[PDB]
């Protein structure tokens, strides 16, 4: 009914209040940063999902544009607050719309080195192994017989 | 040293076992070493930064 | 639901234009109380407008032809 | 409360009508992971079917070859055959023939139609055909196996006799192509966070994707029903008897929270089992010696406060010791 | 306690001043969780107006870091320590060796 | 045959110990293996009903921070010690023990005043030393029986519920398994080729039955996978 009610409501902790989080929180971009911002990409904008903890889940290759470790790096963000702002930040400071670094044409969406070994060690084929010399049908038959 | 040492008991030599996966319950290939590390928490939790 | 943008930026001239109309349409159908020509799925006015501006129905002239629709027809109304 | 959560779909999407996407919400904290792999793992292997395991070409006995009248290779015309589905009834094995010229390429439709199988899709392209004098036959044997068997343990089947020789095929008896489940997070009011399954599945198109999804169900229920709890619950029957002596007055009187100077005292009137101490009313204990207001009160307190009374009238005792 | 020691950790948690350490030798009399009597063994006893030692282990106490710093006993009823061995494991130690 | 094949059934309870286990599942056709065993040794290790401690009661000492004249183990390690201990509940779903002991040496689990329907795995579990001739204990533990795991904090639902000081709290972790393994081999069928079975060796802390945990895990999966055994859409 008032303000008060509402702020004895969200500070009483109750199941309601959780659904109208995750509709406020639907297609409203937060702004994350780091600490030290060099360049541009050290403030991207980002959709929010909820989790549960303490700590920022945060994208493993985004990192790559921020130079930011998992070594004990403090981010902070931000909430537009206006309509504009929101817009702005879903059309401009969004990730995906960040590919490419302000100095080199090349991505910024490099693969990190976790992604890389696997697909190196996914490619790296040796002479002889299970099912050497045969033939398949197609890429899903592929996949049944390794699974 | 450790070799004979990991002889003595009936670990393998390599100190590398091959691992089962919990989710789909297969076989790690290239067997994972694994053994026993000290570790530390540092002075840097979470609930004096969030 | 919404990824990226460049289907829009295509179609217009750069990115200020855009976001400058798409928010005046988002303020227009928020407080304007006007109803969203494509249909809504369950989201904020911004994913609404950004539908809008990318099918192509939604543009800097057709919102200056509709304000000045709007406003002949309220001078009509007051005669 | 030992009661889980039953999970409650939100979407399936039957996209290409045989690609097939199921959702499910929510699971527990780790049902989703094992529910997936034991999806997989039943309808990539353990899933029964029917599909082309033996050919026979008229013109060529050989794997290795070069036959004219086709512009594909012979290998190219065993990868084409071996991806077509068929269904066949309680017949667990048939043999088929192919019979056929022309100009253009034969394909599924060119089947013989025979009332003991079906094709799923006449129009899949199985051979290219030259358009001129090229006259080609050939004999498919299909049966009824359990799931996907590789070309190697085929070609060993075949050493062990081969009296004609006989060509053979990677045979898929497995009706479902490919098979991913992914598990991610799902919000609840008040858990923290479960798992939302999202299985995507295609199968060969002979059945449905949601078909197969209840034939895995079913197989694993098959499977595990020697060991749900022999029945529902297994316990529609209650039993509360009442026996004639209270199992308290059984234990000693020292398990009464009591103090060791109280116990001493007690100890001293050759007074062990509370069954022996019921039957003893205050007129003895003003009596007996070093028995003062703090040792009558905890006597009185912590032995009638657990529901019993101090002086009663029993004759039941000790049943039977 | 740390399994890949160094050697070093049996002198690091003596030298340090968070141990008790046996000041004189002897039985240990009077365990408990809060304090620890030792009766002085009569070789190293004083010859005149002699006694027991008292070490008074010190509980979950503020410190510098906000950090909880206590003192558990490791010895038992007549268990002898000598001179100079520990008596109470202090924080982040095990039987006289570094625990970090 | 080629198609409807057997059902597996359970032959073998033998245990080895009070606590390792070892049952043989058999037998099973192919592939069924790995995936029965992967799927057992998860709804094992997930939830199982447990009858741990989550609540304790103790007169003299008022908050676990302190220390109590008597006892050689400061009260941290008195809540580990019990939380390590292990009981059966039968009848109730919740119950209060009650500890009384006194004069110098090791108070164990046997020193308890058991009850009926309260049954202690292993007596020799020690719990405290009491250091003291002239020092009693006397303390109140709370075991409740429920499904999986449940950290100290948020258990509590109301500050008013533990307004008394002397009601402590612990994270009732109530899991009997602590360990399951399982292999499959080549079953000995009669006459027939490439059967499946599955001995599956289990490290618990004995409070559970072995048969009766495989057959409530079976019957927690069953009853999880009848939610899409007649999937259509619904909400
Ligand atoms: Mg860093």
Redesign the pocket.
Known sequence: TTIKAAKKMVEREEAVVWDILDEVIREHPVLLNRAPTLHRLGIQAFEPVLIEGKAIQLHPLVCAAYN??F???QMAVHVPLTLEAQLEARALMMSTNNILSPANGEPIIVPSQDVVLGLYYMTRDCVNAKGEGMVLTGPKEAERLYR | EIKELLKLGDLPTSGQIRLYDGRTGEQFERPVTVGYMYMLKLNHLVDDKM | ARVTVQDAVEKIGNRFDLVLVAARRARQMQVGGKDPLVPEENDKTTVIALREIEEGLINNQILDVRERQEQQEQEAAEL | VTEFLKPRLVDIEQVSSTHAKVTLEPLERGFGHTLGNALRRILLSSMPGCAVTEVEIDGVLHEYSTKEGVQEDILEILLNLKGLAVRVQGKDEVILTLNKSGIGPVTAADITHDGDVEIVKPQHVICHLTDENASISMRIKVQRGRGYVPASTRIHSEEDERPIGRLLVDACYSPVERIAYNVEAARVEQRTDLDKLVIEMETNGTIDPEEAIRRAATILAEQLEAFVDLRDVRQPEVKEEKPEFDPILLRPVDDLELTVRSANCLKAEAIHYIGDLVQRTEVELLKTPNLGKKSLTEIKDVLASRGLSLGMRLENWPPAS | KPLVGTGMERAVAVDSGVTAVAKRGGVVQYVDASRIVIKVNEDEMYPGEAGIDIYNLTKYTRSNQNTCINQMPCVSLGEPVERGDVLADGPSTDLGELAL
Request: hydrophobic share 20%; aromatic share 0%.
């Open positions: 930011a470790d070594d004990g790096d």
